Amino acid sequence: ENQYYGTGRRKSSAARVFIKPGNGKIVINQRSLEQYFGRETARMVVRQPLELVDMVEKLDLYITVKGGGISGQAGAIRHGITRALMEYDESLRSELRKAGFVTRDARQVERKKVGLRKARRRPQFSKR
Amino acid sequence: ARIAGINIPDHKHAVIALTSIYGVGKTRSKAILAAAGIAEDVKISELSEGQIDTLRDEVAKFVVEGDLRREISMSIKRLMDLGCYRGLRHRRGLPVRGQRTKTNARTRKGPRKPI
Amino acid sequence: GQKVHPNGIRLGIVKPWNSTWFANTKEFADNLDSDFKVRQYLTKELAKASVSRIVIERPAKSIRVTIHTARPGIVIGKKGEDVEKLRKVVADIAGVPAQINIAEVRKPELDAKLVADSITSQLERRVMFRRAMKRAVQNAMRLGAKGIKVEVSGRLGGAEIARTEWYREGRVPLHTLRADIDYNTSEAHTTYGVIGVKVWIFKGEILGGMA
Amino acid sequence: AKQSMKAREVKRVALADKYFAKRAELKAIISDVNASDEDRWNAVLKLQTLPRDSSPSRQRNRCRQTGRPHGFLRKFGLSRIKVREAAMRGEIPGLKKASW
Amino acid sequence: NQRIRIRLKAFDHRLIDQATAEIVETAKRTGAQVRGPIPLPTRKERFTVLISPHVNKDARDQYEIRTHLRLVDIVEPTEKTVDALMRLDLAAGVDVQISLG
Amino acid sequence: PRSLKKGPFIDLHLLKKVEKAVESGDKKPLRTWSRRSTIFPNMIGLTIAVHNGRQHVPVFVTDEMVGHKLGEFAPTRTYRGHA
Amino acid sequence: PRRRVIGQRKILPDPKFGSELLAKFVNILMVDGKKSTAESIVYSALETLAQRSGKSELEAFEVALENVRPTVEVKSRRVGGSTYQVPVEVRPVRRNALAMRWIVEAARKRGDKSMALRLANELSDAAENKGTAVKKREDVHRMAEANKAFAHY
RNA sequence: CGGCCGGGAACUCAAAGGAGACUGCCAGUGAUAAACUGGAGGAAGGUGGGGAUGACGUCAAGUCAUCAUGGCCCUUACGACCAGGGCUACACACGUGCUACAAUGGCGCAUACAAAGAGAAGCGACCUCGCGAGAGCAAGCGGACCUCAUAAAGUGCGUCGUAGUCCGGAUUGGAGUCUGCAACUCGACUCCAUGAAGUCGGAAUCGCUAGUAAUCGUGGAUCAGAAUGCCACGGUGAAUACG
Ligand SMILES: [Mg+2]
Ligand SMILES: [Mg+2]
Ligand SMILES: [Mg+2]
Ligand SMILES: [Mg+2]
Ligand SMILES: [Mg+2]
Ligand SMILES: [Mg+2]
Ligand SMILES: [Mg+2]
Ligand SMILES: [Mg+2]
Ligand SMILES: [Mg+2]
Ligand SMILES: [Mg+2]
Ligand SMILES: [Mg+2]
Ligand SMILES: [Mg+2]
Ligand SMILES: [Mg+2]
Ligand SMILES: [Mg+2]
Ligand SMILES: [Mg+2]
Ligand SMILES: [Mg+2]
Ligand SMILES: [Mg+2]
Ligand SMILES: [Mg+2]
Ligand SMILES: [Mg+2]
Ligand SMILES: [Mg+2]
Ligand SMILES: [Mg+2]
Ligand SMILES: [Mg+2]
Ligand SMILES: [Mg+2]
């Protein structure tokens, strides 16, 4: 048909979302949403874009996500759904922007630096 | 609930209570219960005496308690008598397994003694 | 503070590598040893030939040396006698058939290595260090360097206390990565010890990059 | 390092390639599951007669220019000072300062 | 005719790009079908050394060697193509590995 | 602990010395530097001067010492006390 | 900061309740970045507290929080050479933060077994105004009144 | 019912080349200025984040034990080699770390989600044996292909119910495995047994402003074997800044 596509990205994760005009089914890596995300917050974060611009029962989406962890994959899925919705409708841009879903969160990590035990954690100092 | 001449807590489960015997740990207690046929979860209390007698007979197959303490003391005393390096460390009261003694040997050396 | 090596910080951006060959980790260290041997021998031989930059380039079964020198006439000597001698010796050192090429530097007053070597030669010959360094700076600026800085360090004039003296003319922007800063050092083994000489020559800025 | 420490190194590399095969052959019978007390004991007693600098583990990596016994990278056959000096002069093909 | 696969490895990327351009031009001119040049992932081998001579542990230099790969696949080779590619010798400092079959 | 496949390790010079001593029947102390050699039953009843890095310490080997190593009976450090 | 006037970071609302205040409470409760565990604890505690003390979780939580909020705190100024403990009115966002922080620490101290049970007990106790958190609030108010003499420095 | 195989170059991804962000546009404050505050669009907004890059000089700072090097000194010894020992001692003091003192947890079962790396005298699968460390046989692979290599925290169920405990693991005894000529001094790891102190630590003091702190695992160099150190990688992920 159309298979409206959207690529979402989060710190190390990459999601591919295919929206289709059908019922309200979510298929993530040949799993149900509840099967994949045991986190209720992750489920809700995936819900968020559909709930805002009401399309929950109007769209089938097929999702495949690679890399990252639970929250990263959920964020990437949300970003991809938002992008797919924008491509599909193009009128929801303003609502999605004001919600805050269009922006790609660019915070990945701070590398460990020589001399510091972590990215910024400095070794303990002594005066004497 | 008296096995090998020591009292054993009743409210505890069978696996954990059995460990109270000197010479029986976690794996050995599991093996004893498996051989006897008693489940691990069931508590020491509400056990038929026949099963407790079976537990005693199973425990009898290991050197556990006084006898075990005597054996360990004999081994250490034999090391002392031989006059080897391990025996010397034992009688001095210093770490035997080649740990540093400049610092951090307070388990063997006891609390700190000021000069 | 302590400054970074101008050539090392500009490798890839504006400066090329001296050794340019690929090797797997099996043969990397042996290649490094052979390259060190070749460069050492070549410098020792052509000390008096004003050699500026030895460039080693290895085909999978060949060793190609490229000597950048101010005076090709002296290094090649009579027809091919001296180059053949050098070629056969470097071949035995490397253990591979060798091929020597010679690139002529038309402006030995703008080459930092040559300038530093001349200053150290003068210092060994017991000239006045200020006189030598001023001559070098004037020669480079006259030849048309956008800038030059020269620094000498250690027991100047046989003084018990060591000092550092440096002269700069024009501009020599070290922090500008796209700049073309030719930099090299040398050491004069005078009767009172070692005297270090450092030379920066800012020839220009390469906008195109060109690696 | 000392010219004698470097000479000692060249001695542990030649003795080790000289007695490489026997050692391996002796280790085979000494580790072989299908050997014997008379065989394994005889092979284990012969291994401890060989020239000692013949064993690999009695060799230590050292810079190929100074002999420095510490800070030696295998891919550079060099220590930590010399690698930097050569890298700054653009002599280690494909060596650039990182800044990821 | 079984296909010939070519793996190019170089420390410099523009050099390897020019080298693979020459190879693909030769093979494509001589008729055979080029399949590439596929960019395979680069190996970033990083090193960290102490820069101070004596004692300054926090003073260090971090170096790295970056190895670029290029995969050029030639299928249905012709005799003219296979001899021409062997005739062509590329710039030094570019390791070529021709695996065939 | 050395693996049981390989068996206990003992030095050739000490071995000829102890077998020759067993054959000879003499009771002179055996000077050795082989602290790493394990004690064997045929060695029982002999005086062996094991090197401690400074001097050769005489060890009269007994049946209980079988399996141990000669170095265990030749302490190398000398510590009386701090005060 | 000597020269910086950027405000507070935007925080997302609670998934299951849509409350920024509840989200901040979860963040305060959270330790070692284990948000899942802290969120489960607070949700269970809120449900238990709702059933026990009233109608809804937000109503019970807000009434408890209001009973713990401090009107005035004390800081240590240094003007006359020595340090004067002077009272100061707390801005509303700091009121909420201090109330939540006091509730969490008081719940941690308590001797009950489960953390959710401790949180529910402490929340109900604070609502009834007999808890350790309300005691802490009354203590700070009491000390502020004691040193109120320095209210014009 | 495995992207596995026909196939497809759509998408992820792999690099190479480009576009994009400039207070550029709007409003306000302002010296009619620079600039600042908001906001429109935009993936990104005011140096977007991070790194590399360290001016003239200071401390006769550090390194003659990397090296080079002036002077001085030893030359059947201050140099040469070999075996054993030591650098690992132990009344004690200081510094930097790791593991804990537990229920936001321990243990048991089931189950999900990474990134970055290394590998030929190397990484070593599958299968068989061993409670286990491992052993035997042994495919593959100079590797987006094969191996290291099962991520852990998490999620679900059960149990323990506030104890010096089913917390904690030191210490010690016995038995072993592997590397290595060789594990006594003086290795690592495994199994059984044992189960110290320790219940959040005075004065004082340290680090950190965001994907940071905190917490959770993974890899690499050095290296026959020998990390709680060092250097990297990702998972989860805060509080606060009035001044
Ligand atoms: Mg915006
Ligand atoms: Mg970290
Ligand atoms: Mg520096
Ligand atoms: Mg010397
Ligand atoms: Mg199918
Ligand atoms: Mg803005
Ligand atoms: Mg700068
Ligand atoms: Mg000085
Ligand atoms: Mg001084
Ligand atoms: Mg100092
Ligand atoms: Mg010696
Ligand atoms: Mg020391
Ligand atoms: Mg030690
Ligand atoms: Mg539990
Ligand atoms: Mg690799
Ligand atoms: Mg087994
Ligand atoms: Mg324990
Ligand atoms: Mg044990
Ligand atoms: Mg006590
Ligand atoms: Mg306790
Ligand atoms: Mg090692
Ligand atoms: Mg290693
Ligand atoms: Mg760690």
PDB file of N, CA and C (backbone and C1' of nucleotides) and ligand atoms in Angstrom, chain E residues 43, chain H residues 118-119 143, ligand 15:
ATOM      1  N   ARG E  43      39.615  -0.266  10.654  1.00  0.00           N
ATOM      2  CA  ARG E  43      40.190  -0.675  11.932  1.00  0.00           C
ATOM      3  C   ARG E  43      40.950   0.499  12.540  1.00  0.00           C
TER       4      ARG E  43
ATOM      5  P     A H 118      41.905  -3.958  17.783  1.00  0.00           P
ATOM      6  O5'   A H 118      42.494  -5.351  18.280  1.00  0.00           O
ATOM      7  C5'   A H 118      43.122  -5.463  19.548  1.00  0.00           C
ATOM      8  C4'   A H 118      43.233  -6.902  19.978  1.00  0.00           C
ATOM      9  C3'   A H 118      43.654  -7.881  18.893  1.00  0.00           C
ATOM     10  O3'   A H 118      45.058  -7.931  18.710  1.00  0.00           O
ATOM     11  C1'   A H 118      41.757  -8.725  20.027  1.00  0.00           C
ATOM     12  P     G H 119      45.681  -8.260  17.266  1.00  0.00           P
ATOM     13  O5'   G H 119      45.493  -9.833  17.094  1.00  0.00           O
ATOM     14  C5'   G H 119      46.054 -10.741  18.030  1.00  0.00           C
ATOM     15  C4'   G H 119      45.468 -12.123  17.886  1.00  0.00           C
ATOM     16  C3'   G H 119      45.569 -12.756  16.507  1.00  0.00           C
ATOM     17  O3'   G H 119      46.833 -13.355  16.281  1.00  0.00           O
ATOM     18  C1'   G H 119      43.375 -13.040  17.368  1.00  0.00           C
ATOM     19  P     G H 143      41.897 -10.132   7.255  1.00  0.00           P
ATOM     20  O5'   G H 143      40.845 -11.327   7.257  1.00  0.00           O
ATOM     21  C5'   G H 143      39.547 -11.173   6.650  1.00  0.00           C
ATOM     22  C4'   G H 143      38.463 -11.605   7.611  1.00  0.00           C
ATOM     23  C3'   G H 143      38.037 -10.554   8.632  1.00  0.00           C
ATOM     24  O3'   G H 143      36.880  -9.867   8.173  1.00  0.00           O
ATOM     25  C1'   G H 143      38.701 -12.531   9.755  1.00  0.00           C
TER      26        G H 143
HETATM   27 MG    MG I  15      41.819  -7.307  15.419  1.00  0.00          MG
END
